[PDB]
Amino acid sequence: VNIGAVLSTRKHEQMFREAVNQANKRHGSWKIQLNATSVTHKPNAIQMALSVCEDLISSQVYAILVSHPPTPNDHFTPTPVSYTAGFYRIPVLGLTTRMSIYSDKSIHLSFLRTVPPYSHQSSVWFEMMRVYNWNHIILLVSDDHEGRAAQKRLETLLEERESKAEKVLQFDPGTKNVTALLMEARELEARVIILSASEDDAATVYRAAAMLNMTGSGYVWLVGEREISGNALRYAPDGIIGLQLINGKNESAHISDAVGVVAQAVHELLEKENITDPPRGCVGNTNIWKTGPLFKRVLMSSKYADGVTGRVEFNEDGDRKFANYSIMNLQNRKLVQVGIYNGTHVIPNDRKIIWPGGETEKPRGYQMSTRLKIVTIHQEPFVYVKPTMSDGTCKEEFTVNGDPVKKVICTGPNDTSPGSPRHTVPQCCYGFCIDLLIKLARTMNFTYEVHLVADGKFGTQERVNNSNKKEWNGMMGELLSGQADMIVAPLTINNERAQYIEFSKPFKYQGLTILVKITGINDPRLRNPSDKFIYATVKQSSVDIYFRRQVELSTMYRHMEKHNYESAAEAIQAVRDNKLHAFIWDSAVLEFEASQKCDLVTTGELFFRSGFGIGMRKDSPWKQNVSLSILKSHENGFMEDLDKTWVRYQE
């Protein structure tokens, strides 16, 4: 029942003596007979470790307490005591340090604390983010050692929220060239600055942002416990969200809470059976504590009914119990406060949140980024690739119908992939998708960046690798990341192709159609292929997913996967010159081929009638504008004009 302690300052020793003298048996009901002893920390790390190894484990101690700020290791962490007591499964109370790397159960077997580490701070930040729908955030963490674990936890929680952030990487510890990333963040979704570095590493970023006037509206600064103290309050903008946990700042209150937790743990241990003493660490003794895993379970895997904090639902890692927060605001270094976290959900206090932008309501955090990468993909019915007339200048033509043709400056290859590998000549593209892009550009103002992608494949998930992981490729892999979220292409939403992101309203329902030289699905010629029935369609398209879902065309899939070409210009030129037999694509291409060529039968035999929606990101504030534009185009007379100009175009 002997309990030890290791402090450095006399005030901590006096507080521990008072705590073990008075109000020591109040925790619980059993009359404890603990023998509390304290060891003064030595200025040298080796001498103190030797004193620990010769006193604590020799006196058969059960728990300790390390809360002195001036550690002899000059690193603000109890390194020697922990490295010496970890062998005997001793619960080293590391409440003096907040390093999330030391709180991990990987390198430290028995190492608990009563101070929220960087992981708990990141969890609280993530909980505060989902309240105001802060999905696309940026992380400006400059620290490396604990910053890596912080950003890993952040990205894992973002993936668990069915989303993905944009900036979760570090740049440099304590740098001054953050002007580029700040200017890039000036045109992003949210201005929520996530900084979880040390004092100087955060002060450098603060002064660098102050030199660039980065103190506008919408900048939600999330700081930790020891990030703004002494002089970092001036470099940081006035109005930062200063997190603070109960009994975290006051040393006496923290020591009292730790003593109460230790008393509750000892009482819970005495409640059950198997009350054994740790092996005495004398010379030649290399015994392991038998009740080590059980002690870890009763510490972190169980709950606490009483104690100093008087809360329940203790964390499963022994870092910090989820309780009420005391987050105080620092508007010009005053006593103002913001919404505190009450362990399960943030509850607003009497005075609402004050923001540095100037107002008190919800600031302009969730801002629509004007930089929208409009990736252009080569399509057969809509995109008409042709060399540009003038150098860097397109001539908008006008057909015999009532819809004008607007050519966009599509920067990309001038021809298909087999023709040229890749070009950077800004040719002219025009089509239904181009007209929709022009309508969206003239409706709402935004900086569009058009660029023609090289490949023309959709990039399904049938035989792709994607760094040996299940993700999308081609032009859809960048959509989930957040770079090119607006794709001007009629993506058929009929299967798990669109289970991650939601598309817009389907504007066409033509579906898919086969070509004849196989006149219908009921004919055995279409079901059972042959040597001449070639199915050289676009590789990794929706037809592949449709054939994977259907189980009656197993003999057809064998002559389908090994025939799909990567490009489509060679395929359409072959099927036009009487080389291919079956080509499953949209009805507009077959209609145009039948209009321009009379030798082709073009029976159609279309029976899919699937919808065609514009590919857009699910979590984005621009997916509603696309639906509104589609609805306006449908209710107006432009629908039949676009149809007669693009789909049913006769020459």
Partner: protein, 408 residues
């Protein structure tokens, strides 16, 4: 200079033969204070090691204290890490507690261990398993440091390997088992390969539970990393004959085999970086009260005797001379091959049947089939060389084609 070979192993070997090792190991007249010493830590406790370190530090500031043991212990590893972080001395882990690989080491610590890392062990065990066409594995981790990195490396190796690998549920042994919540998990394990990433006592307990609950059969091949078989003098009786033990060293690579290499690397680094720091042996005075151009992070590129003994950011041999051995019948480690820096040099390419692993195994269900080259039958072909492996549909046939007629 001074080479303090603090051999703390249990075996009482003659330390007189260590002083005369300066001659053949680059006997140069540049080091002046060559105070070569050797101790023998008898009591297995951190206090004795701390006292020995504090006594050696007072001996005219002894620098470069190479330490090594015989049994891998988690306490000795943490103690040496703390010593290398505080005193900032380039310690060289040879064997035992000095070679216990941890998960995350300190950046300022110069703990240079000898052997293979967890990723190298995973790579070589994956190569061994793929050489025998064994894809049904069961990974079992524990609370010891090196489980999350190990499972991450396993998942990474499974992803890039497109030849098929049965990824069963991972069993965790972080908490103590009471034979009430782990027997149901061990009963569901039906794979042949049993990845047992635990300690010695934990492995003995797992083998005892498997023998008591009827889990040991003629198809279960247990595989243990270098953490389990971290010694060549103590072998438990619960381990059956055939336990694949991939150890970074054996009786051939004893302590004296690496002491000379470490001394040579140290004196080479000293002779190379002596022009920067004139007074290299500069340490603290004692344990009471008490990186710019030193020899801390400047010995990670010395190539001794051609061996690629370079260290990583944390410090570990990139290309160690590890020997892969198995367990024989008479409780001895029978050598079956090794692993070279280029590829896996499996000496015993023919995997034995091992119809009776333990003593109480009367079941003998190991057969043998012989086939020849026939035109209407299966056509004799070669293995796919794009990944040095094949698929489950193509059964690996043990060929016996000779190079020449006169050659044997």
């Amino acid at each position: 200079l001074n080479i303090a070979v603090l051999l703390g192993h249990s075996h009482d070997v003659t330390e007189r033969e260590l002083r005369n090792l300066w001659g053949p190991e680059q006997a140069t007249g540049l080091p002046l204070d060559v105070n070569v010493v050797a101790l023998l830590m008898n009591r297995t406790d951190p206090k004795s090691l701390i006292t020995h370190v504090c006594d050696l530090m007072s001996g005219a500031r002894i620098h470069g204290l190479v330490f090594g043991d015989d049994t891998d212990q988690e306490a000795v590893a943490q103690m040496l890490d703390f010593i290398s972080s505080q005193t900032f001395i380039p310690i060289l882990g040879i064997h035992g507690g000095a070679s216990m690989i941890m998960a995350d080491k300190d950046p300022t610590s110069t703990f240079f261990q000898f052997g293979a890392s967890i990723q190298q062990q995973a790579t070589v065990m994956l190569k061994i398993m793929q050489d025998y066409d064994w894809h049904v594995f069961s990974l079992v981790t524990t609370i010891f440091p090196g489980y999350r990195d190990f499972i991450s490396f396993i998942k990474t190796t499974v992803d890039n390997s497109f030849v098929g690998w049965d990824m069963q549920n991972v069993i965790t042994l972080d908490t103590s088992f009471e034979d009430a919540k782990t027997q149901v998990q061990l009963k569901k394990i039906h794979s042949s390969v049993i990845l047992l990433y635990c300690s010695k006592d934990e492995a003995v307990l797992i083998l005892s539970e498997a023998r008591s609950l009827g889990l040991t059969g003629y198809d279960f091949f247990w595989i243990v990393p270098s953490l389990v078989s971290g010694n060549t003098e103590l072998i438990p009786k619960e381990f059956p004959s055939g336990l694949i033990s991939v150890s970074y060293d054996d009786w051939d690579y004893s302590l004296e085999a690496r002491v000379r290499d470490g001394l040579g690397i140290l004196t080479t680094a000293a002779s190379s970086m002596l022009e920067k720091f004139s007074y290299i042996p500069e340490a603290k005075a004692s344990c009471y009260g008490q990186p710019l151009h030193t020899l801390h992070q400047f010995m990670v590129n010395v190539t001794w005797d051609g061996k690629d003994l370079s260290f990583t950011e944390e410090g570990y041999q990139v290309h160690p001379r590890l020997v892969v051995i198995v367990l024989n019948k008479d409780r001895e480690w029978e050598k079956v091959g090794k692993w070279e820096n280029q590829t896996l040099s499996l000496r015993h390419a023919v995997w034995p049947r091992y119809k009776s692993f333990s003593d109480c195994e009367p079941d003998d269900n190991h057969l043998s089939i012989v086939t020849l080259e026939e035109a209407p039958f299966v056509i004799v072909e070669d293995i796919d060389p794009l990944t040095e492996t094949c698929v489950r549909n193509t059964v690996p046939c043990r060929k016996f084609v000779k190079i020449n007629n006169s050659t044997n």
